[PDB]
Amino acid sequence: ICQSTSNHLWLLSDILGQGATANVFRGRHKKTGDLYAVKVFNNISFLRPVDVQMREFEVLKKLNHKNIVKLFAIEEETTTRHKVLIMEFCPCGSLYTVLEEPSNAYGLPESEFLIVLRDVVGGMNHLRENGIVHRDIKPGNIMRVIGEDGQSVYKLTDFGAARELEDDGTEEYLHPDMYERAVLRKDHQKKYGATVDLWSVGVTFYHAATGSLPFRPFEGPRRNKEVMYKIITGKPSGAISGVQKAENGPIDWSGDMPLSCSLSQGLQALLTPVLANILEADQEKCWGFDQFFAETSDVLHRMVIHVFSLQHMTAHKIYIHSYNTAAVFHELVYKQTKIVSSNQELIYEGRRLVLELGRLAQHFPKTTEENPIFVTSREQLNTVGLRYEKISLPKIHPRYDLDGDASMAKAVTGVVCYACRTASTLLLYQELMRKGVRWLVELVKDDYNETVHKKTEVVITLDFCIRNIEKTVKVYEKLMKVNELGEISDIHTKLLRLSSSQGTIESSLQDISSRLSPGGLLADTWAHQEGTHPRDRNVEKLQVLLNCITEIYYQFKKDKAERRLAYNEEQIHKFDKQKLYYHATKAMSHFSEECVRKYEAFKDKSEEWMRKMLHLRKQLLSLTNQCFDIEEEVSKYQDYTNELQE
Amino acid sequence: ICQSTSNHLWLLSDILGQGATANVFRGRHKKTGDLYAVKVFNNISFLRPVDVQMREFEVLKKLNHKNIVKLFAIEEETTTRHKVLIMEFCPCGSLYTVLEEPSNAYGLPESEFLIVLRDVVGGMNHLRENGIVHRDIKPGNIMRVIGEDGQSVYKLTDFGAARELEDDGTEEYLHPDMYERAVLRKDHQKKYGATVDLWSVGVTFYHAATGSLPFRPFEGPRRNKEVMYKIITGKPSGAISGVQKAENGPIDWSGDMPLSCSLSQGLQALLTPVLANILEADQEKCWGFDQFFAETSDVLHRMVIHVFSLQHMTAHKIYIHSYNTAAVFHELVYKQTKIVSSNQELIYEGRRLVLELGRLAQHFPKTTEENPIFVTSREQLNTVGLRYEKISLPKIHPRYDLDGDASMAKAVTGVVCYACRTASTLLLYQELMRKGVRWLVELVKDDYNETVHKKTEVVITLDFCIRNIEKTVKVYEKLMKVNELGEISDIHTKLLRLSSSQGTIESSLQDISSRLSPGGLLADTWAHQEGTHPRDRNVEKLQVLLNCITEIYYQFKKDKAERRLAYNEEQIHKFDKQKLYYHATKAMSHFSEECVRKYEAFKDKSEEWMRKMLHLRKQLLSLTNQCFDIEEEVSKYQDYTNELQE
């Protein structure tokens, strides 16, 4: 069973999109065999001239742009005559298809979210500048295409079909108040048009960022309308999300992102205010489109520099502009870590880092997330570590229900996947911790060696001075025998008084030099015993279990679609259900007993090591300052005044 | 290409109804081959439980009633699974299909309109009493079925599908003001629900009564919305229809029916007020449903008595209740004809008619429209005749356009058909006029004969009286010779004075008896020379021409559906177009020069005859009263006093 045109051909079985106004099928150009999406209008929309066809064709083909699905043609069906739209086929699906993946159950990965933001905002931009104001922007109509470079590109669709065929040929039979409802309708094209798009886009962005809707009531929005109404109409400015727990009561109120959202703190700091200003239900303080575009563009233009706070054990993505100086950079690092500029000490690839007070970000060293700018303070702070949400497995209902079981397996797969991500991140913090510690130790040893250089550099001076006055006085009171003998003796005595202090400094320096050996207390051997290693393979164990669970889930999706099963298929379904329970339970057990425990052990020992290290650092600095004071003092007696002679 | 269930089977080619939510096909029960209409839902409406199915099934099958299309089943499609509705097939089509006939271009025939009213109101009644309030009632969903007795029965459909799938899964993405539009929506279930139905029904009734919408703007309602809005929202109480002529400007205002509407004056008098109260746009004065039902039921329960005003030459349908007396009857006849009760003189089947002051309408004589109660006054009135609308042929545009030509032929066929109806009615008025005149003459002759009977009855009395006093006096003055001789002579003289008057009356009676012969002025020979006769066959000539025109019109409909033609087919189309011009022109020419002219001639001569007849009638009455006075006078001298004797 197939339909066709003069150029294209498609099967009815191969549906892609479904709407009570038109259908989307995947068909081919029969001259080339190329895949295209065809929009066959569900009849009705005819006995209408072909010049509206050509004008709308010209204005829709003018919409030839990235982030917008390309329109190829408007053709007639062979037998049924009704019009079809030849447009670009997006094989990967839409944004909704992506968000339905359990790996994205708690929001998209950060890079992908940046991609989504960029492409959607671009599409809106090109749409508004061409006269078209979108009304409904949702993940359902945000298509996805894999670019030549590998990374995805999102395209807006379903915008030209602004056909008003709803109402309730009832035009010449409706009460004047239905016309008044139509008046209440046409008051949206005033200013309630280019700003509602902002609302829907805000909701879409929250859904993509967190993996869940911003405003949730009982069990679902459509499943409980009357409360949803007040939830939406009630929220004040600054608010982001309002969630209703329990089976009734009020709500919970947040102007921040959910804990389960893994978007970096910086991007989140850039994303919260725009969402708050975009989800407002009045005039002025709802943000006009232009400023929203300037804002989003501002965010999307910034480059990212990865830094790692080694005192809090926390990773950071700083969103700096491509022209901003190092000052604002330090202010951002402070803003996320609460360590102020002059306290910030930086390390890159085993060596120190110093930023000129006006160095641009273009010329900054290139950092991945596994090779960042390690940062530390000079004072004593507390370790913070990863802040995730302790999500627990959903109760796997002992029953038999294909739909419910499919949904259940979806939820479980999502949770276990989140556990996998969290485990990986914990391992990352651990590894970066080890690397940064090794580097920091080997970087303190440098300051030690330099200090010793300075010290001996002054000790040869003391030596030559004392030796010199000894010589000169010896030859003086040998040649002239008598004399002043009691005058220079004080210079000698105070030089010795300096040499003693030098000895003390030598001793203490020896002490710290012993503590930076192996064996001693300030070695990095706790980092080899505590925590989890790559060779432990915990992440890939969780990955195996997650693979089993995922397979079972896909299977339950397939079973759900089949509506009901054969005898054996049913028994297999049950078996695999309990098997899924065991897999998930084992995975979570291994995540808690093996991945988190040792993580926190490593963490605590890292804090207790950080204290000692910082302490010894301060001691070293003190001794260095002492050496400098000695050098300052000895620089006097190099040239002194002798008595005037006749 | 066919779809099927376990019990039914249908073709996609065999469509009946089309809607962007579900489709109606004509299919069969494959066990019996019986025709049924199947409503295959246009997908979308699924992944929804089967208990809503069974409950809605139970509440929709509870709607088993006449004037409502029967619901037979709810079944699954074989392959596509989606639900279909097995319901009664109405082969004749809907009310819209009926109104699209050119014969009903200017409103339905009266009996059929009464049928429509009855059935629609009944359907609404059974619907409201069962919880369902219809929102959209239009000719499009008022199906038609031919009953066993031959006359049509109308059934309401499309009421259970109150599915709210319009809005613009955009629930969790809409701005709060769209929800506020939904609030502006759910304020219709308050009282704006059981009263909007009344509006739509009013519009439907006007459309069925007149053959055109009550509120028309430029070229069309949907073709000009912004004006239609003010046309509807502007009309005051009492108004019925507002039509906008020209290409702009204000409007025309009517609280009455169009001239082209052939609904009888009585039914119209019963129909205008209900429509006015049903097309109001506010609260109290919009009529609650109960009083509307009582009103419509009141109208539908009345019987019809056909009377024919012979002085105005106008037919009338009196809508009397089946229990009302003759008094209210006379008041209705007066109300339509402006002749008051005591002036009304009635004739049935060649004889007089007298109604007791409290005679019920059940026992009234049975009258068709070709055998009515002829009515007349005693005073002198003017003939009115048929009041139709002089509709002219639309300009047949010299061009080539299948759609426009089809529409044109439709209009032309409508006009010519109206001309046919009008011609037939004129012939009817003429024939009833002839019959009633013949009867009235032969009914005056009766009064003449009766008058003569009375007259001679008194003349034998005068004769015997005069003869008697002659005898008695003769024998008196023979036997006694002398005497009083001068006393009785005055009685004799006055008796003779009466006999003279008797002679005069005899003479005048002779005169009127000559005027009721053939030859004389008051014979019915003008009615044989003037006007048009059945043997003239003018109606069937118009019918032949109309047949040609109708054939051409159907052909143009078929050609329109084919979108474009072959060479020869095109040339034939043109030929037949001009042929249609000639047919229509000839028909209208024959209607004017032959049917209307002679009609008005007959009419005028009928007036001029009515004057003379009424005059002679008054003369006859006067002479009768004279005869009665004479009888009263002579009744004295039958017994008189003689002198007292010793």
Ligand SMILES: O=C(NCCCNc1nc(Nc2cccc(NC(=O)N3CCCC3)c2)ncc1I)c1cccs1
């Ligand atoms: O525009 C619409 N729909 C947008 C998508 C349908 N059309 C297109 N589909 C594809 N490829 C594709 C591949 C795999 C899966 C899918 N389907 C989805 O991802 N879905 C289904 C709805 C929710 C998410 C699509 N390419 C281009 C287009 I254009 C409309 C639907 C109904 C009226 S308009």
Ligand SMILES: O=C(NCCCNc1nc(Nc2cccc(NC(=O)N3CCCC3)c2)ncc1I)c1cccs1
């Ligand atoms: O209910 C609907 N439609 C009402 C009618 C369609 N359904 C039925 N049709 C028939 N027989 C029949 C025979 C000849 C012609 C027609 N068609 C018409 O007369 N039309 C087309 C629309 C305007 C007037 C129907 N019997 C029973 C039914 I149920 C709906 C349409 C779309 C969604 S619901």
